[PDB]
Amino acid sequence: HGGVLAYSLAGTWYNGFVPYNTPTGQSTIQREWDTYNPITDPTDASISCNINGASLGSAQKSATVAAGSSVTAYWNQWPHTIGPVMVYMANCGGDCTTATTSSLEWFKINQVGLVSGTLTSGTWGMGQLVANNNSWTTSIPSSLAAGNYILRHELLAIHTSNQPQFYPECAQLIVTGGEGATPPASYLVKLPGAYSMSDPGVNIDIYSHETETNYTIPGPAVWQG
Ligand SMILES: *[C@@H]1O[C@H](CO)[C@@H](O)[C@H](O)[C@H]1NC(C)=O
Ligand SMILES: *[C@@H]1O[C@H](CO)[C@@H](O)[C@H](O)[C@H]1NC(C)=O
Ligand SMILES: [Cu+2]
Ligand code: NA
């Protein structure tokens, strides 16, 4: 329970949205997310940028960063330790502030699932996130084409048998520089669309598979540039 409260993007601090408070008056690079609760339906309409995922209009900011830049997301004191961490991006195809995030083409730039051990006693990316000051650091691909992008962080907590808990947040970026590269169509997915309850990593009971050492992370392959 929680989410991304703030960012450090290419050396600069950015405040995130404050959940449970009204969006009126708030100003952030982050899309509006209203509660600490997970999205439990993998096909939920708002799974791209959480509920309500709304733009802040004139108060909506965007972080300008070079392709190749390091981007860090900071969480609350995150209480869950079992499941993957995933970082996605999507071209807004225009202004991000006016973009419907559920219509975008999402590609994955970083993930860490089961690093070693078994589902129930192993090391997960989410455990690594907690251990690293409740934060996750990865780079925007060096080659990425300049443009307007959403940067999306997602935690999939799978500690409750057969109930996935998706915790997504979105931040608006202006990506500068780069080398004009775009991910091929095979890396691109929709949100919702990418996930379902037939995915082995989504509809999972870890407690009936306590010697299992494989975990196929849901969603597409990672596009590193
Ligand atoms: C730990 O994260 C907090 C934000 O939650 C940040 O203010 C602080 O600088 C971080 N500390 C270190 C040592 O990275
Ligand atoms: C682990 O491996 C088996 C095949 O050996 C596969 O059927 C199963 O879905 C995998 N589980 C996950 C969570 O990826
Ligand atoms: Cu929780
Ligand atoms: Na904008």
Swiss-Prot record:
Its biological purpose: Lytic polysaccharide monooxygenase (LPMO) that depolymerizes crystalline and amorphous polysaccharides via the oxidation of scissile alpha- or beta-(1-4)-glycosidic bonds, yielding specifically C1 oxidation product. Catalysis by LPMOs requires the reduction of the active-site copper from Cu(II) to Cu(I) by a reducing agent and H(2)O(2) or O(2) as a cosubstrate. Displays catalytic activity on insoluble cellulose using I-beta microfibril model substrate.
InterPro entries, A to Z: AA9, AA9_LPMO
The entry's keywords: Carbohydrate metabolism, Cellulose degradation, Copper, Disulfide bond, Glycoprotein, Metal-binding, Monooxygenase, Oxidoreductase, Polysaccharide degradation, Secreted, Signal
Source species: Heterobasidion irregulare (strain TC 32-1)
Cofactor binding remark: Binds 1 copper ion per subunit.
PANTHER family xrefs: GLYCOSYLHYDROLASE FAMILY 61-8 PROTEIN, PUTATIVE (AFU_ORTHOLOGUE AFUA_1G12560)-RELATED
Enzyme Commission number: 1.14.99.56
Residues annotated to bind O2: 159, 165
Gene giving rise to this polypeptide: LPMO9B
Practical uses of the protein: Lignocellulose is the most abundant polymeric composite on Earth and is a recalcitrant but promising renewable substrate for industrial biotechnology applications. Together with cellobiose dehydrogenases (CDHs) an enzymatic system capable of oxidative cellulose cleavage is formed, which increases the efficiency of cellulases and put LPMOs at focus of biofuel research.
Places the protein is found: Secreted
Pfam family, one: AA9
Cofactor: Cu(2+)
Entry binding sites for Cu(2+): 1, 80, 167
UniProt keyword Glycoprotein present: yes
Principal place of residence: secreted
The name this protein goes by in its record: AA9 family lytic polysaccharide monooxygenase B
GO CC annotation: extracellular region
GO MF term set: metal ion binding; monooxygenase activity
Lineage of the organism: Eukaryota, Fungi, Dikarya, Basidiomycota, Agaricomycotina
Family: Belongs to the polysaccharide monooxygenase AA9 family.
Catalysed reactions, semicolon-separated: [(1->4)-beta-D-glucosyl]n+m + reduced acceptor + O2 = 4-dehydro-beta-D-glucosyl-[(1->4)-beta-D-glucosyl]n-1 + [(1->4)-beta-D-glucosyl]m + acceptor + H2O
GO biological process: cellulose catabolic process
Residues with attached carbohydrate: 133, 214
Positions bound to (1,4-beta-D-glucosyl)n: 20, 205, 207, 210
Disulfide bonds, paired cysteine numbers: 49-170, 92-96
